[PDB]
Amino acid sequence: PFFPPLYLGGPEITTENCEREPIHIPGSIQPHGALLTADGHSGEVLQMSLNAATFLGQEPTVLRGQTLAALLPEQWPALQAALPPGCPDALQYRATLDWPAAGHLSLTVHRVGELLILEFEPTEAPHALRNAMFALESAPNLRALAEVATQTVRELTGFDRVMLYKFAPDATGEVIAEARREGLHAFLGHRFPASDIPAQARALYTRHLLRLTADTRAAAVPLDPVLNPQTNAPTPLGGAVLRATSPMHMQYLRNMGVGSSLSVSVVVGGQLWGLIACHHQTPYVLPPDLRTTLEYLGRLLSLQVQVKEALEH
Amino acid sequence: DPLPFFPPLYLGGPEITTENCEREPIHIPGSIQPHGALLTADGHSGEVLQMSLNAATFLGQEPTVLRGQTLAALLPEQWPALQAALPPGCPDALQYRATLDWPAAGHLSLTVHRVGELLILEFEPTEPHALRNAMFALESAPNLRALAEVATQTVRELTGFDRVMLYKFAPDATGEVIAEARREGLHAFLGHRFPASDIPAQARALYTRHLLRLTADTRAAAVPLDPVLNPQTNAPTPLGGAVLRATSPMHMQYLRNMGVGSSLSVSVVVGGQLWGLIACHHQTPYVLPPDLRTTLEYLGRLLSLQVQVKEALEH
Numbered sequence: 001p002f003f004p005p006l007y008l009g010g011p012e013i014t015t016e017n018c019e020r021e022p023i024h025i026p027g028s029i030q031p032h033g034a035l036l037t038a039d040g041h042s043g044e045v046l047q048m049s050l051n052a053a054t055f056l057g058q059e060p061t062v063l064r065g066q067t068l069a070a071l072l073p074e075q076w077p078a079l080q081a082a083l084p085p086g087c088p089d090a091l092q093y094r095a096t097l098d099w100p101a102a103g104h105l106s107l108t109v110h111r112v113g114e115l116l117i118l119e120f121e122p123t124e125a126p127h128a129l130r131n132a133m134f135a136l137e138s139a140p141n142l143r144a145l146a147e148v149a150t151q152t153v154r155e156l157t158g159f160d161r162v163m164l165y166k167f168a169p170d171a172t173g174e175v176i177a178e179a180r181r182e183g184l185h186a187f188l189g190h191r192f193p194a195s196d197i198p199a200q201a202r203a204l205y206t207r208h209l210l211r212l213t214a215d216t217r218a219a220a221v222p223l224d225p226v227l228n229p230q231t232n233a234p235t236p237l238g239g240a241v242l243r244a245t246s247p248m249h250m251q252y253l254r255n256m257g258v259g260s261s262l263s264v265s266v267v268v269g270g271q272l273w274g275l276i277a278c279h280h281q282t283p284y285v286l287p288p289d290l291r292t293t294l295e296y297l298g299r300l301l302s303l304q305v306q307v308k309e310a311l312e313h
Numbered sequence: 314d315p316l317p318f319f320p321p322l323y324l325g326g327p328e329i330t331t332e333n334c335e336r337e338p339i340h341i342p343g344s345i346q347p348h349g350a351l352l353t354a355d356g357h358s359g360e361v362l363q364m365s366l367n368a369a370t371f372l373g374q375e376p377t378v379l380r381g382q383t384l385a386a387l388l389p390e391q392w393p394a395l396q397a398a399l400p401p402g403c404p405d406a407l408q409y410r411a412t413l414d415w416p417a418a419g420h421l422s423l424t425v426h427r428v429g430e431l432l433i434l435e436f437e438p439t440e441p442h443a444l445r446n447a448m449f450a451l452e453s454a455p456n457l458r459a460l461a462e463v464a465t466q467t468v469r470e471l472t473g474f475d476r477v478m479l480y481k482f483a484p485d486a487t488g489e490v491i492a493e494a495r496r497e498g499l500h501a502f503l504g505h506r507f508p509a510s511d512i513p514a515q516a517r518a519l520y521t522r523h524l525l526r527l528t529a530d531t532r533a534a535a536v537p538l539d540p541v542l543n544p545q546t547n548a549p550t551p552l553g554g555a556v557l558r559a560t561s562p563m564h565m566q567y568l569r570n571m572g573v574g575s576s577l578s579v580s581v582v583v584g585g586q587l588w589g590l591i592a593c594h595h596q597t598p599y600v601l602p603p604d605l606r607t608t609l610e611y612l613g614r615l616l617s618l619q620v621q622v623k624e625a626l627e628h
């Protein structure tokens with residue numbers, strides 16, 4: 001099963017009980033964005049991140065009464081149609097708001113049962129993706145495909161280190177390709193134990209295909225209330241990219257000297273084949289539109305891995 | 314019966330009839346569609362060899378001036394990028410794309426690929442979260458039918474085409490329309506089946522390697538290359554990989570007779586085989602700009618993946 005989260009007086013996590021931390025329900029988010037939850041029917045704002053006032057420019061109480069209808073007039077009917085009752089928690093809808101306080105915000109919404117989860121992040125506003133797609137497809141074998149993928153991602157993102165991280169049948173991991181800035185340790189060829197990514201992290205990564213720690217030293221921002229009014233239970237946040245990272249994994253990233261981290265699942269035959277794993281030495285908020293490019297690349301790599309593995313077997 | 318290609322018309326080959334379809338050399342027509350321009354150049358020196366006859370009007374230069382310069386001089390910023398992206402021996406399927414600001418012609422999209430020692434350069438005029446939203450909707454579709462319907466509707470919304478269909482090949486190469494989105498008033502093709510020879514075996518082979526093809530105006534005359542043969546080889550210039558390549562006059566007669574002014578299909582490739590086509594129709598001529606066509610190319614790949622996934626959920 002899972003332990004209760006901390007804020008419901010559950011045990012603190014160790015290397016004895018890695019597998020039992022409820023990472024999906026941390027009750028908090030990373031501070032480079034803001035999150036609101038809301039009722040599926042009424043559009044009634046039920047929870048907000050204590051930092052919402054910053055991003056939205058709204059007097060705190062104003063929000064926690066109001067309706068999405070009021071708050072987002074153009075958007076609220078689109079949401080209603082895009083995310084019908086009963087849809088999967090994996091389905092997401094995005095829009096760009098030109099919002100008074102903040103030039104442009106990206107809005108990302110998904111639905112978990114009766115709750116809409118809304119994420120707001122700063123945003124903005126060429127051929128590198130098309131060029132990359134053809135490059136991946138003409139790679140002659142899996143090894144070269146891995147090399148092209150890591151190089152392409154590094155060029156698109158500027159990340160200090162991009163790895164392709166492949167799982168063995170026992171969930172042992174192996175770095176099979178790597179693109180990195182001069183003057184970093186090489187992780188190429190190295191293998192790491194299964195517990196470095198515990199079973200409950202792997203399952204959640206099979207369904208929700210991208211996560212990131214934008215700053216490995218930033219404090220999480222609580223949800224208020226912490227419990228969903230609807231259920232008097234924790235809000236599931238695993239489909240939210242803003243979700244606070246496990247402190248265990250923040251300790252791991254800090255001990256390696258990483259300041260910003262991101263990864264993309266490569267899913268083949270319904271299973272987690274591996275990860276595009278990215279490191280930056282310093283804090284780094286990759287903007288939403290560039291993340292989208294990596295999300296596309298994730299799908300394309302999933303296709304090409306199967307194609308390429310089929311021409312060996 | 315499968316038989317080798319006839320020589321093209323310009324090398325004294327025969328004219329093509331319903332009797333001998335499968336032997337038309339559709340990859341070497343010696344000509345392009347008039348809404349863009351094409352140059353060929355030597356892959357090592359960058360000497361310009363062939364050009365479409367309309368090139369002066371896209372590129373704003375006399376032929377003899379174009380042909381008298383190397384790509385190093387014509388494309389000083391792109392020439393080194395081309396050479397890195399398209400190394401000798403690379404496959405003909407690999408494409409490099411850039412946007413140019415050309416004085417006379419505005420923003421041009423440049424698409425380049427390499428066939429042996431030849432570079433092929435295509436120039437076309439070029440111009441929010443719809444793709445991301447579509448990607449997730451496709452993935453959440455519960456079964457093959459719902460996927461097919463979401464895919465057709467999405468493509469129609471992105472493009473404004475009068476008709477978008479998902480055409481699926483059977484094992485005997487007969488095809489069937491299994492989903493479609495269509496303009497009000499058009500008659501339905503859903504569930505209809507069409508003989509295998511409607512898309513002969515040499516088109517289907519090409520359609521497995523080069524995944525998008527089109528006919529922007531089914532009445533437009535093709536524009537010859539000049540000279541027609543590659544001076545490197547005194548042989549035909551391979552245009553399989555060029556979206557500007559002229560369409561088989563057999564196929565254009567088949568489209569005009571249907572009332573279609575514009576056509577475009579995207580290949581859906583599963584396990585190395587052509588599974589089906591995203592086929593689109595417009596009643597009037599219609600040019601879809603290169604950046605919009607890129608969205609369809611990306612959806613072609615997504616759909617190939619999702620078709621595998623939906624079919625595996627099915628035994």
Ligand SMILES: *C/C=C1/C(=C/c2[nH]c(/C=C3[NH+]=C(/C=C4\NC(=O)C(C=C)=C4C)C(C)=C\3CCC(=O)O)c(CCC(=O)O)c2C)NC(=O)[C@H]1C
Pocket residue numbers: 013014015016017018019021023173187192195196197198201211212213244245246248249252261262263275277278
């Ligand atoms: C008690 C359990 C421990 C534990 C937990 C844990 N680990 C993750 C997530 C990740 N671990 C990763 C491992 C590596 N990254 C690398 O760069 C290398 C090698 C150089 C390894 C072995 C990765 C890639 C992830 C994914 C997330 C990311 O990209 O940063 C989690 C889940 C984090 C979250 O989503 O909140 C957890 C709980 N780690 C341990 O070392 C043990 C002691």
Ligand SMILES: *C/C=C1/C(=C/c2[nH]c(/C=C3[NH+]=C(/C=C4\NC(=O)C(C=C)=C4C)C(C)=C\3CCC(=O)O)c(CCC(=O)O)c2C)NC(=O)[C@H]1C
Pocket residue numbers: 330331332333334335337339488490502507508510511512513516526527528559560561563564567576577578590592593
């Ligand atoms: C003598 C041979 C004939 C022939 C040749 C032919 N056909 C193609 C390509 C295509 N044919 C297609 C057929 C259909 N389009 C539809 O909408 C339907 C059903 C409602 C069918 C059956 C399609 C979709 C294509 C693909 C290209 C496109 O999407 O427009 C070629 C190759 C064309 C080229 O690439 O230059 C050839 C030679 N068609 C016949 O009917 C016989 C008489």
